[PDB]
Every structure is written in structure tokens, then in C-alpha cells.
């Protein structure tokens, strides 16, 4: 509900270019726990077909010793 509320706020009064950089040994880069949120936002969903089985796996254990 609020991601639309911020998007309309920009377009009411919109008020206004990338070249490489160098890794420096006197500078830190974001890593650790917030990097896990940087890779948990954009990745491939899988649409599950929810089913109800429970006998195919059951006898699969019975036949195996």
C-alpha cells in the first residue's frame, strides 16, 4: 500500500553517468547479513502445484531395507 504512496509522491514534484571505479585497500564494502537481503529480493520464484499424495512415498520406504 505504501510503495504506491511513495511513487505518486515523486511524480508530483520530480526534481532532477556511471564509469568504473577501483577497489581500494582503505575502504569497506557491504557484506555479511545485509548482503543476504541483497540476494533474497531478486531471485527465481517457483510456482508450486500443491497436491496430496502420501502413499507413493509410503511404500517407497517399505520396499527399501
Amino acid at each position: 500500500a505504501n510503495v504506491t504512496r511513495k511513487q505518486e509522491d515523486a511524480r508530483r514534484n520530480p526534481n532532477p553517468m556511471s564509469v568504473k571505479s577501483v577497489n581500494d585497500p582503505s575502504q569497506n564494502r557491504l557484506t555479511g547479513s545485509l548482503l543476504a537481503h541483497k540476494v533474497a529480493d531478486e531471485e527465481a520464484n517457483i510456482e508450486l502445484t500443491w497436491a496430496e499424495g502420501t502413499f507413493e512415498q509410503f511404500k517407497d520406504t517399505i520396499v527399501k531395507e
Binding site: 556511471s18 568504473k20 571505479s21 577501483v22 577497489n23 531478486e42 527465481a44
Partner: protein, 218 residues
């Protein structure tokens, strides 16, 4: 019991001294064979199903050390013996060992000194990997060594025994081009490119004043 080298008592920790000496003799002999042989990374993107046409944030920056570390891994490893680094007055001073001259070189030395008076500029390249400094000293030491064989050369003021006709053209057959006019023609090309960038200079200048004059009106 002569004062040079008796092996005669305990002599603690001489082994590190021993193989250092046998390695410095090995080092200088590999310097001999360099002489004998010489005589003769944009930016990358990808196409996600979620966000297509997205560019990689890690490829935006460069590490500047992974490329250096590849070759540094592929260098030879050696264990430094603190005896090996020894230094004397003959250290860190320019000058090297001159390869001593042969008599096969003297016929190209006497005749090049027979044709001209004494001209060290063009005779340097005749001996391709000899330099201007030590060949000047070869003129100097022969004054004391062979003073009379040099004294025949300046008396000779005539074209010599006509065998230099090959060595007249053996010098000439390297990069056969009319050098009296080869330098002229490409120099005229160079000032043509400078005149064209000078045309590009002022034509960039006149449109710039034209454009911002319109901004001064508005």
C-alpha cells in the same frame, strides 16, 4: 704452512659460506650466454527474468590485484641466503664488462676508420649491440697499443683498396628507401594532420560562441 687455504680446524658454519661461492660462479656464467646469443575488462551485464537489462554491480569496479597476482604466482621461488647479498664498492655503479674484440672485427674497424676520419656516430650501429661509449675508448687504447698501424690510416687520403663496395651497400640494404626524401614526405603528412586538427580547433570554437550567444539572448 702457506698462508693461503689450509683446512685445519673446527670451522663452524662454513657450509652456508660454501654453496654461496659455488652459486656466484654459476650466476656469472649465465650472464655469458645472454651475450653469446645476442652476437648472432569492460563492464558486463546480464538478463534476468525478474529484472532484464540489469548491470552487475561487482563488474562496475575493478580489483587491480587479481591480474597482478596471476603472474606473481608464476614466478620462481628461491630461499635467500644472507651471505649471497654481499656488496662492495663495485655495486650500483654504471659500467659493465666489454666483450673483447676479435680480428674479424678489425677489418670492419680499420676500413671504417680508413674511409672516414674518425666518426663515432655511424660506426656504432655497424657493431649492432655495442654502444657509443666503449667504442670511443677502443680508439683511445689503440693509440698506446698499435700507434703505427693507426698512423697509416690518416696518411691514406684516397678511396682505399676497392673491397668496401659490398660494405658500402651492406650498410645500405637495411631498410632500402630514399632517406633523403623519405623523411620529407611523411613530415609533410604530419603538418597536414596538425593543420586539420587546427581546422577542427577553430571550427569547434566558432560554433561554441554562436551557441552561447543564443543563451545570452534568452
Amino acid at each position: 704452512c702457506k698462508p693461503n687455504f689450509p683446512i685445519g680446524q673446527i670451522s663452524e658454519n662454513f657450509e652456508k659460506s660454501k654453496m654461496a661461492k659455488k652459486a656466484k660462479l654459476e650466476k656469472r656464467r649465465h650472464l655469458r650466454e645472454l651475450r653469446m646469443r645476442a652476437r648472432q575488462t569492460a563492464i558486463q551485464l546480464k538478463l534476468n527474468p525478474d529484472g532484464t537489462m540489469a548491470i552487475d554491480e561487482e563488474t562496475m569496479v575493478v580489483d587491480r590485484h587479481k591480474n597482478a597476482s596471476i603472474e606473481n604466482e608464476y614466478k620462481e621461488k628461491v630461499d635467500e641466503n644472507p651471505f649471497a647479498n654481499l656488496y662492495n664498492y663495485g655495486s650500483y655503479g654504471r659500467g659493465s664488462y666489454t666483450d673483447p674484440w676479435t680480428v674479424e672485427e678489425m677489418i670492419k674497424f680499420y676500413k671504417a676508420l680508413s674511409m672516414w676520419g674518425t666518426d663515432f656516430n655511424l660506426i656504432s650501429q655497424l657493431y649492432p649491440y655495442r654502444s657509443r661509449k666503449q667504442v670511443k675508448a677502443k680508439f683511445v687504447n689503440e693509440e698506446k697499443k698499435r700507434p703505427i698501424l693507426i698512423e697509416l690510416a690518416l696518411r691514406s687520403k684516397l678511396p682505399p683498396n676497392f673491397d668496401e663496395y659490398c660494405c658500402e651497400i651492406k650498410k645500405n640494404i637495411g631498410t632500402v628507401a630514399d632517406f633523403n626524401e623519405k623523411l620529407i614526405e611523411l613530415q609533410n603528412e604530419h603538418k597536414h594532420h596538425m593543420k586539420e586538427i587546427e581546422e577542427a580547433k577553430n571550427t569547434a570554437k566558432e560554433e561554441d560562441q554562436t551557441a552561447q550567444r543564443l543563451n545570452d539572448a534568452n
